[PDB]
Amino acid sequence: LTWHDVLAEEKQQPHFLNTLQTVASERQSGVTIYPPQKDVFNAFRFTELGDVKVVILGQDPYHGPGQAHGLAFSVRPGIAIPPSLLNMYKELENTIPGFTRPNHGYLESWARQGVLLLNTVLTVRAGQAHSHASLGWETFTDKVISLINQHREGVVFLLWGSHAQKKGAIIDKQRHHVLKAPHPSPLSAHRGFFGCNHFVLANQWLEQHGETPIDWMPVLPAESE
Numbered sequence: 001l002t003w004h005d006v007l008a009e010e011k012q013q014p015h016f017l018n019t020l021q022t023v024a025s026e027r028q029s030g031v032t033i034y035p036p037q038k039d040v041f042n043a044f045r046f047t048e049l050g051d052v053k054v055v056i057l058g059q060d061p062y063h064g065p066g067q068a069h070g071l072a073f074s075v076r077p078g079i080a081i082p083p084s085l086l087n088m089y090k091e092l093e094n095t096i097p098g099f100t101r102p103n104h105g106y107l108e109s110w111a112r113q114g115v116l117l118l119n120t121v122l123t124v125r126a127g128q129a130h131s132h133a134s135l136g137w138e139t140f141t142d143k144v145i146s147l148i149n150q151h152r153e154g155v156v157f158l159l160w161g162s163h164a165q166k167k168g169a170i171i172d173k174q175r176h177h178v179l180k181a182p183h184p185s186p187l188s189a190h191r192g193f194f195g196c197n198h199f200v201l202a203n204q205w206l207e208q209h210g211e212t213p214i215d216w217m218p219v220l221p222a223e224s225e
């Protein structure tokens with residue numbers, strides 16, 4: 001059972017297709033849109049429905065050049081680690097045994113381990129946070145979260161900040177494992193993100209059900225000859 005299986009009918013809905021047409025228009029209107037069109041759905045590409053172990057919800061994609069590439073909180077290789085990710089790495093360094101500060105902010109290897117890095121809004125106008133928040137992306141990601149709720153068992157949801165917490169209100173807290181904390185951005189991280197211990201807690205839950213825990217130290221694609 002795949003994303004396409006469960007999302008094919010949602011993807012033929014006017015709200016969804018129209019969201020995409022608005023983006024495609026915007027990309028030609030004089031404005032740059034992030035991430036590139038081929039990257040918008042990368043969270044789905046790297047972590048199939050049946051591979052989802054951890055869901056980390058973000059809200060908006062990074063809105064600067066070279067930053068967003070379709071995975072919540074991640075940036076491309078060579079790009080500076082943005083403040084929300086830095087605070088994530090800090091909590092990790094203080095909680096996960098052996099973890100040290102990565103020299104990059106690329107989280108693809110989290111996704112390849114089953115960490116679904118899903119923003120509720122999947123595109124953004126350059127430099128303008130929340131600029132596409134009233135297209136239909138929230139309806140689409142509402143549906144995505146609902147399907148995960150329904151079609152999977154024992155997934156851990158990490159819900160950072162009020163927006164994500166509301167988004168995840170529908171999730172079965174008996175069938176899945178839901179953890180809440182304030183958002184890791186500088187504005188709220190010292191008001192409960194630090195100390196939330198979500199990364200260890202996720203791993204323990206996974207372990208207690210026979211699943212491999214997540215290696216949260218992210219790794220860059222390697223060099224070849």
Ligand SMILES: O=c1cc[nH]c(=O)[nH]1
Nearest residue numbers: 058059060062072073
């Ligand atoms: O992808 C991202 C980046 C920053 N903030 C979010 O919520 N998600």
